[PDB]
């Protein structure tokens, strides 16, 4: 029914087209869906453009005419060149006529702005093709027709707006360099006439709709036009006064002045300086008298969201911050400008109180710009003392929750642990801390007064609330480091005393959890204080140990994070023997570790052991450190020694769910301690290494056996997942130590050999769904650290993992995403640290290597694509190093022209644009090899033939010119890339000018 439109043998039924369009937009369900696939096919018809003429004059549906212009847009963009001058002149004529038609019908011009904007845009597409070479009178004719009708004038402003955008704003990656410069130079040559028109209607225009469209085009012009059109005319006076009073022009006027406000002014010119001050003085005046005074409550206005107030306040914030970040120095020296400077900043203070995350970030960025300048610039901070004093209040009252604070209130009003990590407020908190740290440095007394005073009104209760005590505590913690040690001492003392009093007064686990999180954060932020008073440090730690038994999981988790946070800064005070103490405190901690961690979860127990490891590594006496390490690992070592007696006895026990979990936690504990101790962990590793690799083997047997007896689904069961967890923690432990080992000799001589015998064969002889990608990640670290010391070891790694892993990932880009990523990280480091291993590969395997590198090229996944291109780049370098030997010669005979064609494919397929830069770099490297050694004639021959068959719509000259330019520029990457982008533009159309490739000539 609706498909008769698709049959082009018969004429087009416009009345039917109008209904198909109506069904798609105003319809629903299957009727709408079917009309969608039909309209798509009608548009995709290469001959649909021929029906555009009749649709535009015999259609009643504006949407149909819109789709018609879209069809013409495709043609004008891609095939305008091959179009006989018969159609080119005609299409221009009825598009122009259509535009004139609508501007005369005041009803159409009012109600169908969508179709007029589209038509105007389609005309701009023609201008890009024909103007000014084949249409030199367009501008003088456009200006002449402006006076005939107010609608014509307004619409011409729209055309010029879209023109400026397509030429200056969105031309970079849509035209060739040559054409872009041609169109930019054209507009620049005739802009004087455009500006005179624009300026005349601005001074003598009463039609707001016309004034706005003129101001819209002006905003685009400001992106590029010479400064003289801005400051040498009267236009700044118009924008900053006349057009700020009417709301319908205020938004666009403010955006215009924002652009002006960002311009870098020649600092030597006093007339621009005075002029830059003037339009700012006027703008603030019009705002204070026509919108709201400086005392207005912008917070409330924004929340009410009446009309365009929210958008206006956003634009005002953008204008003030933009202008002041650039030109505030113009206002700081002259006393007559002081009130203007401070009034503007007072508006920003009021804007900063608005409840709007993104708007606050915008103002906060400016405040950072200001306080940082007041921190370094002499004689400036006294100007803003009142502004800064207010700002300290703003920031302190709007501190966002830092990541260390793990408690939050839900919809029932109960304090619970956070489900998710609020990742989008971490950055905000760090920005707030930066500004508040500056403000504290600018007047440390004022900041203490505000915080102490606020803390008082929390005790007396006049302002008590969870939100008020949280923001205050967070602010207190954030300014750590700004005060002197003595000031900080009494400041922290006072804060603790008062927060403890609240913990007493406030009852109920909800109130108790809030204060607990606030004190822990404050204390964690002031290690300098804890260091200076051992009594304080000890008391804190022992109270953190108490909180590890608390039933509220929030308090419990934060106590462990705070413990390790304090240890990272005060570790030294745990290894020394403090006066009035019998032994270092690490002795006490290790001793009671079982009691202290009894109620913790495995993850939390591991954090505790990791913190202990941090402390142990501060002991630089090997004997005492190793003794402490042995004492710390007593519990896991006892459970480990017990379990190896049973894994030897009957491996059937490993089927026990609880035994598996115990093993995993033992190894996770060794991982945690190794993470914080690094090379010093070697003794504990030697205690378990050989038996641990034996366990790895025994666990591998059970996994393999389980799969065969239950199928591949076994890998999903808890039992197998638990067994695989053991293997992955063992590899993680070995990988953690090797990555931090100082003694690489013992790594090679002791660890590497048993490791490879235990993991490689198992990996190779498992079914794909049972292979752990962690093996590859582990081998990568081995090669990275000792690869240069084990040439035969690297070879053995390749044989076991290379071919069997490639067959897993070479059937699509989807399956085994981890193996895919780790696989190419391993090849990457091998190619760098032990390229000799690839020379030992038989010619067949080395062919698979090349096939694997190019396979990575074609990934959209950035984790794989990047490493694929890097390997290619480094593999070329590796061959070039070999000089003129048989292997190098054979490589160029067999694989050079594969890399060339494969690199060119991803450069031009429009589906790998993310890697353009590295693609171009690799291509430049390949080409440059030939132009250093003829070999150069054949390369041009090959490339010319390749591109001819791959892009048959290009002429021989286009390809010839492109390769001439590309081969001359294989030493200038910036120009080399510009030539490729020109080529990518020309392959999307027909008839591209081959002289465009002489742009850099």
């Amino acid at each position: 029914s609706m498909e008769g439109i698709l049959d082009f043998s018969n004429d087009l039924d416009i009345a039917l087209l109008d209904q198909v369009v109506s069904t798609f937009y105003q319809g629903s369900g299957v009727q709408q869906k079917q009309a969608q696939e039909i309209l798509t096919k009608f548009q995709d018809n290469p001959d649909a453009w021929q029906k555009a003429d009749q649709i535009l004059q015999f259609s009643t549906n504006p949407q149909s005419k819109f789709i018609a212009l879209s069809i013409l847009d495709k043609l004008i963009t891609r095939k305008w060149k091959l179009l006989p001058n018969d159609h080119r002149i005609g299409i221009r004529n009825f598009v122009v006529g259509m535009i004139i038609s609508m501007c005369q019908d005041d009803e159409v011009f009012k109600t169908q702005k969508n179709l007029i904007n589209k038509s105007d845009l389609t005309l701009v597409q023609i201008l890009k093709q024909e103007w000014p070479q084949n249409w030199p009178e367009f501008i003088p004719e456009l200006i002449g027709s402006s006076s005939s009708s107010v609608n014509v004038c307004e619409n011409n402003m729209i055309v010029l707006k879209l023109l400026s955008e397509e030429v200056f704003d969105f031309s970079a990656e849509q035209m060739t360099q040559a054409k872009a410069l041609h169109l930019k130079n054209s507009m620049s040559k005739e802009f004087e006439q455009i500006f005179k028109l624009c300026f005349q209607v601005l001074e003598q225009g009463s039609s707001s709709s016309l004034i706005v469209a003129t101001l819209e085009s002006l905003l685009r012009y400001l992106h590029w036009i010479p400064y003289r059109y801005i400051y040498e005319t009267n236009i700044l006076e118009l924008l900053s006064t006349k057009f700020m009073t009417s709301p319908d022009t205020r938004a666009i006027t403010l955006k215009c002045l924002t652009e002006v406000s960002n311009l870098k002014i020649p600092q030597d010119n006093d007339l621009i300086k005075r002029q830059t001050v003037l339009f700012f003085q006027n703008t603030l005046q019009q705002i204070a008298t026509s919108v709201m005074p400086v005392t207005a409550d912008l917070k409330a206005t924004y929340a009410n969201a009446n009309g365009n107030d929210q958008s206006f306040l956003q634009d005002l914030a953008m204008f003030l911050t933009t202008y002041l970040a650039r030109n505030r120095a113009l206002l700081e020296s002259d006393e007559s400008l002081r009130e203007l400077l401070l009034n503007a900043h007072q508006y920003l203070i009021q804007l900063s109180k608005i409840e709007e995350r993104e708007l606050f970030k915008t103002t906060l960025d400016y405040w950072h710009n200001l306080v940082a300048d007041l921190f370094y610039e002499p004689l400036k901070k006294h100007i803003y003392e009142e502004i800064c004093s207010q700002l300290r209040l703003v920031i302190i009252e709007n501190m966002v929750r830092p990541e260390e604070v793990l408690v939050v209130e839900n919809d029932e009003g109960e304090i619970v642990r956070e489900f998710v990590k609020e990742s989008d407020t971490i950055q905000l908190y760090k920005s707030e801390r930066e500004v508040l740290v500056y403000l504290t440095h600018l007047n440390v007394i004022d900041t203490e007064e505000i915080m102490i005073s606020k803390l008082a009104r929390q005790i007396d209760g006049s302002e008590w609330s969870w939100h008020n005590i949280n923001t205050l505590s967070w602010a207190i913690g954030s300014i750590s480091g700004t005060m002197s040690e003595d000031t900080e001492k009494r400041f922290v003392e006072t804060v603790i005393k008062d927060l403890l009093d609240l913990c007493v007064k406030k009852r109920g686990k909800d109130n108790k959890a809030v204060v607990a999180s606030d004190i822990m954060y404050v204390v964690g932020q002031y290690p300098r204080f804890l260091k200076a008073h051992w009594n304080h440090l000890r008391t804190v730690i022992l109270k953190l140990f108490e909180f590890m038994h608390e039933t509220h999981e929030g308090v419990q988790d934060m106590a462990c994070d705070t413990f390790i946070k304090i240890v990272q800064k005060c570790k030294y005070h745990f290894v020394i023997q403090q006066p009035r103490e019998s032994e270092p405190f690490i002795q006490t901690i290790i001793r009671d570790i079982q009691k202290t961690t009894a109620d913790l979860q495995p993850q939390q127990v591991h954090t505790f052991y990791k913190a202990c490891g941090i402390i142990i590594s501060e002991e630089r006496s090997v004997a005492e450190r190793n003794r402490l390490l042995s004492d710390l690992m007593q519990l896991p070592n006892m459970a480990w020694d017990t379990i190896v007696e049973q894994s030897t006895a009957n491996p059937t026990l490993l089927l026990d769910s609880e035994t598996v979990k115990i093993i995993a936690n033992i190894i996770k504990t060794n991982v945690a301690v190794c993470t914080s101790m690094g090379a010093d962990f070697y003794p504990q590793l030697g205690h378990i290494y050989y038996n641990m690799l034996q366990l790895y083997r025994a666990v591998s047997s059970m996994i393999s056996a389980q799969v065969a007896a239950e199928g591949l689904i076994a890998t999903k069961t808890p039992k197998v997942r638990g067994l695989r967890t053991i293997k992955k923690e063992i590899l993680k432990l070995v990988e953690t130590y090797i990555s931090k080992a100082r003694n690489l000799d013992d790594v090679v001589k002791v660890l590497v050999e048993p490791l490879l015998n235990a993991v490689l064969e198992d990996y190779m002889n498992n079914v794909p769904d049972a292979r752990d990608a962690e093996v590859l990640n582990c081998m990568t670290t081995v090669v990275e650290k000792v690869g240069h010391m084990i040439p035969q070891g690297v070879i053995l790694i390749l044989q076991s993992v290379f071919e069997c892993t490639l067959d897993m990932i070479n059937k699509d880009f989807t399956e085994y995403p981890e193996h895919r990523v780790e696989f190419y990280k391993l090849l990457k480091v091998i190619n760098e640290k032990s390229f000799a291993a690839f020379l030992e590969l038989p010619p067949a395997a080395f062919k698979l290597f090349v096939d694997a590198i190019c396979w990575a090229f074609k990934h959209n996944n950035r984790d794989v694509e990047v490493n694929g291109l890097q390997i290619a780049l480094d593999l070329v370098k590796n061959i070039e190093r070999m000089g003129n030997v048989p292997f190098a010669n054979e490589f160029h005979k067999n694989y050079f022209f594969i890399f060339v064609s494969e690199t060119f494919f991803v450069l031009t397929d429009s589906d790998h644009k993310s890697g353009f830069s590295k693609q171009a770099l690799l291509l430049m490297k390949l080409i440059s090899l030939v132009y250093d050694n003829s070999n150069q004639v054949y390369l041009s021959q090959y490339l010319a033939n390749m591109l001819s068959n791959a892009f048959p719509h290009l002429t021989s000259e286009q390809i010839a010119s492109f390769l001439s330019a590309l081969t001359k520029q294989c030493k200038d990457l910036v120009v080399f890339k510009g030539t490729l982008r020109d080529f990518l533009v020309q392959i999307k159309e027909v008839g591209g000018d081959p002289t465009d490739y002489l742009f850099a000539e």
């Binding site: 937009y25 629903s28 709408q32 869906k33 969608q36 696939e37 309209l39 798509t40 548009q43 949407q63 819109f66 789709i67 879209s70 702005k113 969508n114 904007n117 589209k118 845009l121 879209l162 955008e165 969105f170 955006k255 924002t258 929340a303 009410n304 969201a305 958008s311 956003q314 634009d315 953008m318 993104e358 915008t362 489900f419 998710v420 990742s423 989008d424 950055q427 905000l428 689904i713 999903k716 997942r721 989807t814 959209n860 950035r862 984790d863 429009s910 644009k913 993310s914």
Partner: protein, 203 residues
């Protein structure tokens, strides 16, 4: 019941279709099936001001599947622009999608969404996302996989479209369920032996 046309635009692979499906059925589609042209989906939310219905035009982001392209934006009353915080190129193309959108829809509420904040290796830093400021767009970090801020875009649009900044999502009424054997024991067996996805998640 009020109706509003919402267009959803963004580079291919940024998660537009996954985001819509999550709100439609609660599922998380792990596979990438490129959308063709556009898929319209009715979506209803319950608010203290009554139910609000969005007609979501989930357009295709890939070039070769654009279909009518800017023809889908006609008469849209709001929009979402989507990009991927793990792919810098998707943020670089935000200005292009916005350009084509506001050329048709001069004055509509638009939300800019940076999706996939669940992934560890984030490539588009928070400090770099600033395009929404001069264009008066609302911005949210979101994650269709973790549901992080997944309701914010529609909540904000609903407040702008209804004109009530205090509008809230409310619990839909829960009617009483009714009281009540061959090919069930067969379907149950299959579902029993098909492992649940994402067994490592906290839920």
């Amino acid at each position: 019941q009020v109706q509003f046309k919402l267009v959803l635009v963004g580079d291919g692979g940024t998660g537009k279709t996954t985001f819509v499906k999550r709100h439609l059925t609660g599922e998380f589609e792990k596979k990438y099936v490129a959308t063709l042209g556009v898929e319209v989906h009715p979506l209803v939310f319950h608010t203290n001001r009554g139910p609000i219905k969005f007609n979501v035009w989930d357009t295709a982001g890939q070039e070769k599947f654009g279909g009518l392209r800017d023809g889908y934006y006609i008469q849209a009353q709001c929009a979402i622009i989507m990009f991927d915080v793990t792919s810098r190129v998707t943020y670089k193309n935000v200005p292009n999608w916005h350009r084509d959108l506001v050329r048709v829809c001069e004055n509509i509420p638009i939300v800019l969404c940076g999706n996939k904040v669940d992934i560890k290796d984030r490539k588009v830093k928070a400090k770099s996302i600033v395009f929404h400021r001069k264009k008066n767009l609302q911005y949210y970090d979101i994650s269709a996989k973790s549901n992080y801020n997944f309701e914010k875009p529609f909540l904000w649009l609903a407040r702008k479209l209804i004109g009530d900044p205090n509008l809230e999502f409310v619990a839909m009424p829960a009617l009483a369920p009714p009281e009540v054997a061959a090919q069930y024991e067969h379907d149950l067996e299959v579902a029993q032996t098909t492992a649940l996805p994402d067994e490592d998640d906290d839920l």
